[PDB]
Amino acid sequence: ARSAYSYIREAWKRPKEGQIAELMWHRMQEWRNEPAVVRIERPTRLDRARSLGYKAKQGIIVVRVAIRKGSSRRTRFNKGRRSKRMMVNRITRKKNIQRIAEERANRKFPNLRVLNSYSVGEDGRHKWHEVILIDPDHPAIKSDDQLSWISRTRHRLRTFRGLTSAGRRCRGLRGQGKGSEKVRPSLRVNGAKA
Template identity: 60%
Template sequence: MSRPFYNYIGDAWARPKDTYVGELLWERMQTWRRERASVRVSRPTRLDRARRLGYRAKQGIIVVRTRIRRGGRRKSRYVRGRRTKRMGQYRITPRKSLQRIAEERTARKYPNMEVLNSYWVGSDGKRKWYEVILVDPAHPAIRADPQFKWLKNPSNRGRVFRGKTSAGKKGRGLRKRGIGSEKATVR
């Protein structure tokens, strides 16, 4: 039995350093470093991941590659007398993941679009790159599509800022399957 083409793409991206993806990323990083923080791309870099997260090649759906700085918060060193522990300089980290921050920055740049989801496409020592899938809920092709019909409801506006994307749900602890969840209890 033959495997779908998307499985081969997923296998290559699962281990980038062992496959051709590592060389591709090395070349692409040199270009991406010189680009702006948010760049609209014509097609997804990881087609298998994008389609799994809801991307379809149709009008009203775009993909934006967003760059974000790695690491925690930067805080200047306190000048007055303090012992090092009380300076508040180390381990000042945001409560949101870098992926959520990238989604929110992209949503602010494209205010008429809604963030559907996002996925990792690369990182180096200083930055990470995510591709964010955006949908225009007012576009006629989107309004007519039954798959995206739920976006017409005004209660879904600003879903990225309320943690409704996949990365947002993960950060809010809604994707855990552990003790106490309905699927974990066996009777």
Template identity: 55%
Template sequence: MSSSGLYQAVREEWKSLKKSEIYDLVKKRMIEWRHGPSIVRLEHPTRIDRARALGFKSKDGFIVVRSRVRRGGSNREKIMGGRRPRRMAYNKLTRKKSLKLIAEERAADKYPNMEVLNSYYVGEDGLYKYFEVILVDRSHPNIFNDPHISWISEPQNTGRVYRGLTSAGYKVRGLRTGRKGSSKSRPSIRSNGRLRR
């Protein structure tokens, strides 16, 4: 089987995971992931097809990290000052960032010398969602000598995950749509005066 045929087969298995043969294996793995650390460096991507599609290469300078994020909405400490009950709002709060973006940021915090290239979903259970994050060492010779990925070594791409420049960041900022119909979110929500200060 050719490599493209192999990736296609893996992709089809992940498309209908609950009906596929690998479902029991993934379920068993997630039990182990749940009891392990929240951020783990991996030797190989769990979903090789997705990793390759998002730019991963099996060479020095690239690593894959599995990041675990708590599911559901967020809450904050109860406000002790006077408020009307409806303004208390300390639980059932909707996050302004997606869980995927939070997973990327946590992986970047763990590996400060690396830049986030992209990430993809690998599973969820009742408590957590799991993502694998592709990280690139911006100062590695393999990276800045490779014309396809050397752009990430340029200074304007430093800390790109914290500025919403990854794919997940673009989606959260409302920039996935074209120019038409997204005038209120371009160039940013803050610059349009739509962000509550």
């Protein structure tokens, strides 16, 4: 039979419909009154979190992040430039908003490592994502067989290196075949043409 979770999931398929529609209109008011990075006791999308690797365990933290919407907040050239590069308004960053969030959340927690993340909506100018972060030093995590991999030294500052969930997707690493020529094994190693 359907898991209770299956219902949360189901409501977040159409966030502008039914009850969740009214919850958002509610929360988003308290959300806009909160800081950029706010730690929360429980994920607003439980199926989503658990699906991403979340557990109700010591050493596991979740947080909401607000980032501005739109393109790049870019300054106009102060020196010579050819028309092609005189651009400002239509320049958009190459790192999606979800990925900025994950980072701002990570910095707020210097000892923690990003496990994954998910969007929790947006209004006219914010974009919210909740980020799951793990304490790689807390035993209970060091002793958990499904998370202890994040404890490894080789994982220090995952987000900042794009080893995150959205990190790899944004890096054009989804497909294993056609289209990932200049993507795999790394953008930089591919002359940065993807």
